[PDB]
Amino acid sequence: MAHHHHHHSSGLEVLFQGPEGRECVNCGATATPLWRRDGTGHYLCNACGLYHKMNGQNRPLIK
Ligand SMILES: [Zn+2]
């Protein structure tokens, strides 16, 4: 979740393009990032993969 300078930042699954329901495995795919298959038993968006990094959210290998 993230919010900077908007009264409504309800994209904050990614603060961008997700409805938290077409999102990746953890974060906000809605394309082919950490969504389907690549790493962590799922895919690899760097974001979630980043969430794996310092957040330890998921456990693939970022990309
Ligand atoms: Zn993601």
Tab-separated table of C-alpha atoms in Angstrom, residues 7-58:
chain	number	residue	atom	x	y	z
A	7	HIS	CA	-7.252	12.321	-2.021
A	8	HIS	CA	-8.060	8.944	-3.537
A	9	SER	CA	-5.185	6.551	-4.141
A	10	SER	CA	-7.217	3.404	-4.437
A	11	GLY	CA	-4.829	1.858	-6.870
A	12	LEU	CA	-2.426	1.422	-4.017
A	13	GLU	CA	-2.320	-2.267	-4.499
A	14	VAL	CA	0.285	-0.836	-6.822
A	15	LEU	CA	-0.752	2.772	-6.626
A	16	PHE	CA	-1.285	2.272	-10.353
A	17	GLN	CA	-3.208	-0.302	-12.400
A	18	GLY	CA	-4.680	-2.936	-10.174
A	19	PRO	CA	-8.099	-3.740	-8.799
A	20	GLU	CA	-6.466	-6.131	-6.303
A	21	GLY	CA	-8.316	-8.675	-8.290
A	22	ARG	CA	-6.409	-8.949	-11.498
A	23	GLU	CA	-3.293	-8.224	-9.561
A	24	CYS	CA	-0.227	-10.494	-9.444
A	25	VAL	CA	0.226	-13.146	-6.853
A	26	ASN	CA	0.737	-10.501	-4.164
A	27	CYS	CA	0.883	-7.062	-5.588
A	28	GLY	CA	-0.653	-5.907	-8.841
A	29	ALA	CA	0.031	-7.675	-12.041
A	30	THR	CA	-2.940	-7.294	-14.323
A	31	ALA	CA	-0.542	-8.384	-17.124
A	32	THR	CA	2.216	-11.067	-16.804
A	33	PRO	CA	4.506	-9.967	-13.868
A	34	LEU	CA	4.273	-11.944	-10.484
A	35	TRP	CA	1.029	-13.275	-11.595
A	36	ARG	CA	1.145	-16.633	-13.221
A	37	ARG	CA	4.362	-18.750	-13.267
A	38	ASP	CA	8.138	-18.056	-13.060
A	39	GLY	CA	9.182	-18.062	-9.407
A	40	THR	CA	7.809	-18.442	-5.825
A	41	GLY	CA	5.448	-21.097	-7.187
A	42	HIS	CA	3.891	-18.223	-9.057
A	43	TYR	CA	5.437	-15.644	-11.412
A	44	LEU	CA	8.036	-12.833	-10.994
A	45	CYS	CA	7.281	-9.165	-11.074
A	46	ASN	CA	10.190	-7.292	-9.595
A	47	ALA	CA	7.763	-5.426	-7.413
A	48	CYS	CA	6.455	-8.421	-5.603
A	49	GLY	CA	9.947	-9.743	-6.068
A	50	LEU	CA	11.036	-6.556	-4.347
A	51	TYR	CA	8.420	-7.197	-1.841
A	52	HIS	CA	10.389	-10.382	-1.436
A	53	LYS	CA	13.545	-8.453	-0.969
A	54	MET	CA	13.247	-5.978	1.821
A	55	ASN	CA	9.706	-6.858	2.679
A	56	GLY	CA	10.099	-10.619	2.423
A	57	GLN	CA	6.476	-10.663	1.247
A	58	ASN	CA	6.870	-13.304	-1.369
